[PDB]
mmCIF file with all atom_site columns, C-alpha atoms in Angstrom:
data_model
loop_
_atom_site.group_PDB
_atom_site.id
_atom_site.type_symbol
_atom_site.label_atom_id
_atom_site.label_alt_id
_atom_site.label_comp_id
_atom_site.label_asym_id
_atom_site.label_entity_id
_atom_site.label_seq_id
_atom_site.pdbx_PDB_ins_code
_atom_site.Cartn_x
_atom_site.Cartn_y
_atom_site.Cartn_z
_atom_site.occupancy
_atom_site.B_iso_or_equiv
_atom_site.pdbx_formal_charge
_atom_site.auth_seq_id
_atom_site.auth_comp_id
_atom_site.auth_asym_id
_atom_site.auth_atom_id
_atom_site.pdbx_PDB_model_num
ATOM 1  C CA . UNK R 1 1  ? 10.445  -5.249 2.389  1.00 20.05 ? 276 UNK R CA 1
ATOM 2  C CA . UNK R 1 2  ? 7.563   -4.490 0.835  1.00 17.11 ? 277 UNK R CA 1
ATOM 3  C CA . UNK R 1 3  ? 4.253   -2.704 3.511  1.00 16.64 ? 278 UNK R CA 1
ATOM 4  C CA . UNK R 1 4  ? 1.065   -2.620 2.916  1.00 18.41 ? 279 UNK R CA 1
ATOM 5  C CA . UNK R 1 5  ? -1.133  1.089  2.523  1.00 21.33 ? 280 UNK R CA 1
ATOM 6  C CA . UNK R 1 6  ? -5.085  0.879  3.338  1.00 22.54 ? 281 UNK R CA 1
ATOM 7  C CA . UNK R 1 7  ? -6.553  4.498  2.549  1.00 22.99 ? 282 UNK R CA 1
ATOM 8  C CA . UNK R 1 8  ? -10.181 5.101  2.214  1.00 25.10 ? 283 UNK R CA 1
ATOM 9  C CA . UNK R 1 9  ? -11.756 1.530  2.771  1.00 27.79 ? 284 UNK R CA 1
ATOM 10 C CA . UNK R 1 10 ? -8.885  0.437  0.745  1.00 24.60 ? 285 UNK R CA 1
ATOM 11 C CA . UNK R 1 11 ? -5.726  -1.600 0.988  1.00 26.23 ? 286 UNK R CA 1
ATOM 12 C CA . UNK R 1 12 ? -3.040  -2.095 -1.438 1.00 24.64 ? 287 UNK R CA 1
ATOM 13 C CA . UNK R 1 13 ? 0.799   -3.916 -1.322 1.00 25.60 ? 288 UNK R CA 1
ATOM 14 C CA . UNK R 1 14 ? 3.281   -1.499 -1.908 1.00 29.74 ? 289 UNK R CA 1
ATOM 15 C CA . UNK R 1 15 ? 7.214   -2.139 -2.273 1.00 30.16 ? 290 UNK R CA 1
ATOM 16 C CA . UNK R 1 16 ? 10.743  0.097  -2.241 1.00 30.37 ? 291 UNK R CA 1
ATOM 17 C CA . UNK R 1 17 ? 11.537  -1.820 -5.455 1.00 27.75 ? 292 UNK R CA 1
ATOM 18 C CA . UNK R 1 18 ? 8.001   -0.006 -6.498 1.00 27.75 ? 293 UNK R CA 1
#
């Protein structure tokens, strides 16, 4: 399952497999 990390006015797709 991959979960998605918004930081600073920012959002990026992240994944284990990452």
């Amino acid at each position: 399952q991959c979960r998605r990390l918004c930081y600073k006015q920012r959002c990026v797709t992240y994944c284990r497999g990452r």
